[PDB]
Amino acid sequence: MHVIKRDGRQERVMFDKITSRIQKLCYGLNMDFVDPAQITMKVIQGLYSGVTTVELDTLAAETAATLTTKHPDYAILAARIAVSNLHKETKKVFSDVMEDLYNYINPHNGKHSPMVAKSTLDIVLANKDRLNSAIIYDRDFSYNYFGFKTLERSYLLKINGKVAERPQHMLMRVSVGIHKEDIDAAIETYNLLSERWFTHASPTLFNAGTNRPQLSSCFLLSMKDDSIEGIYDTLKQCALISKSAGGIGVAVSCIRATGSYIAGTNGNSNGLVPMLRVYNNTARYVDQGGNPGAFAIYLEPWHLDIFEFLDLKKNTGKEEQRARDLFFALWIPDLFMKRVETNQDWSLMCPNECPGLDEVWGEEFEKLYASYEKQGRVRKVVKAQQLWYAIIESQTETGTPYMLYKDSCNRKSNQQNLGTIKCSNLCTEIVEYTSKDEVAVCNLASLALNMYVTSEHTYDFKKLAEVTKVVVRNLNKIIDINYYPVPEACLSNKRHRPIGIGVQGLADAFILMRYPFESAEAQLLNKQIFETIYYGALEASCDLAKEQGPYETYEGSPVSKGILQYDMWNVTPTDLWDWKVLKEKIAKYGIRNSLLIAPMPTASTAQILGNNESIEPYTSNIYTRRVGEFQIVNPHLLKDLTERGLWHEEMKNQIIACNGSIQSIPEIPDDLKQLYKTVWEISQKTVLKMAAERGAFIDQSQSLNIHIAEPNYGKLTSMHFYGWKQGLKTGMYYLRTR
Amino acid sequence: MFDKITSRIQKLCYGLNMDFVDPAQITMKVIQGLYSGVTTVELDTLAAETAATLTTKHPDYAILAARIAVSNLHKETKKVFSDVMEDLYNYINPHNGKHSPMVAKSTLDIVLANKDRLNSAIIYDRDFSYNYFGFKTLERSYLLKINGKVAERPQHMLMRVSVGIHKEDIDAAIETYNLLSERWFTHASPTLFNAGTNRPQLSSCFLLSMKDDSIEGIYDTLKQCALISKSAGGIGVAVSCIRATGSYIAGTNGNSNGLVPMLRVYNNTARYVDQGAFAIYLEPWHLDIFEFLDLKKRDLFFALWIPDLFMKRVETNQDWSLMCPNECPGLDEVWGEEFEKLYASYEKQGRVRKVVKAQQLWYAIIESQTETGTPYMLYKDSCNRKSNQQNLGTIKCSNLCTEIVEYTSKDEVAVCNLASLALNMYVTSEHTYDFKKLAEVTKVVVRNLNKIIDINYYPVPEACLSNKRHRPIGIGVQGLADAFILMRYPFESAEAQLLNKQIFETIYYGALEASCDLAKEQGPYETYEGSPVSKGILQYDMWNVTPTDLWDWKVLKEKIAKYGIRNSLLIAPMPTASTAQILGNNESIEPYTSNIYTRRVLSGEFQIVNPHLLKDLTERGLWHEEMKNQIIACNGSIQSIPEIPDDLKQLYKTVWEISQKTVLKMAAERGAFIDQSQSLNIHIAEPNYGKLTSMHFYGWKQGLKTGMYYLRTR
């Protein structure tokens, strides 16, 4: 048997040499369980002569990754093999690749189509030496297989279907893309990114240092006014945003209900459903071409078209009464929740008959709403619980609508001084003001929370604060570099300068510290982590305000009155940080950014870093990743089981037989059982309480999924009302069942 | 008893044919609707309904039915016009309490300041001049209602429209009221709905060109369509500049979804804003053409804007090149030789996305038409070559009903302003045709439509700009089939073919003469210089036709040469569906499609026979029930009934029995005196693809701008 080497030369297939190559990539790996010869063994099995070394390497990487279920270090080794191959197939110098990317000519068009911006190239070429040698290519080997494959599919710029960028090249591109002539700052960011302390959001990773850079790609809009002109002006906006691959949250409550009089045409309105069909089909059409844009529609439950809204996503239906490509969210007043639990009547209104209900929150809302009721300006009254049942029925069928508490959102916004906030975003973590003149933008990054635990099971709070400060500075530079799809978005970001720093690997950080998710230790660590993030962020924002002045609309805001997020929740922080000293710095200089913290879903970027998503418990101890499908065991648990000598073939079988649970396996000690409880075994009320406790230090909101195995009306009711009573801004993102 | 009811019916039979109208026949049905507590008004609807069911015995029953229903209306409405206009203005909507005038303040003030002359000029006996079905059409949509009760008499409506158009010009208001109430012509439905009201959108049609080939442009145009569709107007949209499926997007590095998913957004918009009908025009070189020929196979109507080059390639069995407008720009901005040179240049340059047999595309078009009746067939080069607006640039589409050929661009949406002459009115008691009177009324219609241009509520600024720059109008017709019948002329006869030429020579002549008088009083339209008529070329010169000796075209050309004209375009025979139903005429230029047809009036169905035919048959003692049923069994034909004279069989051929090439040729001949185009349906009973193919090609070769509106197959 012969391999065809890269140089096209024929080489004898040899067990020792293949094993040998794998061996050289095993530095720092657990050799008690990782065996190079194990891979060589399975590779040589199904192997025919005529295979190339690139094919051989691919096979060996794919084989190493099926052995992840024997030890997690195998997944790292698989990436090490893949990257080894990628290095052999790539140019070594950064500035070289940047030239190749810029000089790109489309083959079937003949047109010069630079893949990076000229001004980025220029900065790179002016600083070749420092930039090229700052790069540490050994950092490419820090990923696991599934992280690498995510990067490889979407994130490494390709020349004619062939990957041209090493992970390190991409990271330096982003860094120069953010910092331009500030080479000191670029290298600081490159080091932080490549050592995996944090990551910028996908939009930034994709387009930093490219032409017309789309660095932020989540947006929020309010319907202009209640007219064909307003509706179609907003539609154009959403189309234009969606063309730039922007996700959107849209507030729709100002639009007349079905049957409402139209004084102009002497006819009656079709209401929300037919209009939302236009938006649905706009989402399908403007999907960047060939592949659907994502719009989350926000509706307040006093609106007369609420029941039909609650149906638009049902898979069983009537097509013309369906909009299954949109996402649905409720923007809920406290009054509704209070009428539900007291079993009172709820009045359904048309916003044209009852104007300004969306422009008003809390006591002002309850007062305006109560007088409309007293004046008999109501279209239909139902028992409030009837609407409640429709809500929970919808969630049991579809997992939605999302649950947002309008008064919580507004009562505890530092953007309070701008007017009433009418909605959240696609992912329910952003609470930012919108108006006719203003489309809000989400500028996002996440901290990797697992990275701040030390070899001694202590949490490095100082490091976390220091990294956060860099993140604030980076996102603040992104606000000015960003190419905006509509000018209302630019206006909004330049005026209030919000940002959204989030997290990943919360579950990993608990496990690394040896804390069960529900323990006193994890609940206190949870507060501490988020105090820290809020503290460092305010401090960076304050520093930028000293250097550049506060944001335009700073005067009048709660923070300008010395009110921080936890003051709004009536929470007293722990003694970890001196908040009195921070307040005194803020009183001096103000802050650069109206909002700072917003834990988003980290679907794609958490996979790249190899962390569990967001603030979420591991949903299972055994799960699959699609690339073929690959079986993955929780890497923390697998190490524990192998270190103890407990792991075997049937042991994996029994955990799959238990739906990824380890609770009923008698050979596992109880301390391990409590460490590795699945989300399905963890109290959702506890999840809700932990979110509220970290919530006091999050000036935006958090994308909170809820997991109820076998839901009924009683389960869904008690969890929603618990979340509400905790003070949560987002009571639920998705509902997950099984 | 029976006597009191019969006599009451008899009192409204004046002038009717008593050989066939029998009031006791109505009484029998009314008699059994009696009870203690029955009002004579309730018995009056029973009498009008019964009389209307008896229309199938003689058409005068429908007149009796109308006279009964109108007597009820007169007793349930106020008799003085200024009083009714006041009640319409003072209307307070009780749901909110907000004052919501149903007429404009400026109209009421004109009425009140002139109420002596206006109240007294009205002739309420003219309310009885509609038959039952025409009056029921009026009553349901055309007469303003206060809390579900009709406030406007037809006379009130017609005088409201007249002051709506003419305002302070009372003399012109009354002249128009007289012509309308005597039914010499009618204004289009939107004018009848909206004149003298707060939102006077008086125009019927709009046409638009797709702005840019981008998301921005697609969604700006969409907004335009939503805004227009708010004002109930129909829409023609040119779409050929939008890049085809799979074409590269530079800004997103993706591939365009093509026409279909774009059209679904428009479809949805049409459904959503009713208070909506868009016609989509595509040129057959567009790469998405085959997938376009499938969308209706949904609230959109489809049309082809066809170059001669495609037609030439089809008949010569050659290849046709499909192109994406992003790879091959400008194909729609150019027509005739300029298109053919550009098109061939792209062919030779290799920039062609797909090449098919022209015949393959041709048959895909045929199959689509036999299944759905569409796409409409428009000949882009004929439309352009013979247009007075051709000095503006290439015309990119027509309208919803294919009669309007007007320029569109980024800056201009075309609108048309429409009316129709009732051609049956102009046949004389001596079976001659009053051309002098037709010309006269036409002159009034031109002036009415010019006033409409200036007072119109425009839904978008681009529509306003377009109409004020070029001032196009569209004067059409109805009851052409009735004019032939009244003259005793079979549709296809030499006498009908000549009267057809003469009628349209006359309309064009009178229109041009009024437009020329207006140009003298007010100056020509802004864009007049450079146009074909400024060079002394009238429409018929463009067809190479010499008019008959009926009208003095030399003298008229002298007047135009000296003063020019106020309107860039004048004539456009539209379908007239609703207003023809009001006036009791057959629509437009088309033959009777059947001698027996049904009309629904709410919960009632009524069998109606061609009124001329029913008069001929009853008078000859031929009409009976097995006779009616025989004709129904023959799909409304009388050709196979032995007891009917050949004279009558020749006169009452249905459109299915009339040669479609003759229809096309008669369209071509009147078309030389038609400024725009005409809504032309083709009717083929047993349709093979060969028959249809030879009808498209015959119509094309005849020089027709619209080769086909709808294909009907049964």
Ligand SMILES: Cc1cn([C@H]2C[C@H](O)[C@@H](COP(=O)(O)OP(=O)(O)OP(=O)(O)O)O2)c(=O)[nH]c1=O
């Ligand atoms: C025109 C139109 C409006 N609408 C809806 C959309 C808007 O929410 C609402 C008002 O549309 P508008 O465009 O504002 O209608 P209008 O201005 O003529 O009437 P008014 O003065 O009473 O506002 O009605 C329809 O549902 N269908 C329609 O055809």
Ligand SMILES: Cc1cn([C@H]2C[C@H](O)[C@@H](COP(=O)(O)OP(=O)(O)OP(=O)(O)O)O2)c(=O)[nH]c1=O
């Ligand atoms: C963005 C987008 C465009 N399109 C279509 C609509 C337009 O006809 C066409 C161009 O869209 P454009 O808005 O013009 O896209 P672009 O300007 O970024 O790309 P280019 O430089 O090539 O013009 O592509 C889609 O079908 N789907 C999409 O998601």
Ligand SMILES: [Mg+2]
């Ligand atoms: Mg309005």
Ligand SMILES: [Mg+2]
């Ligand atoms: Mg473009």
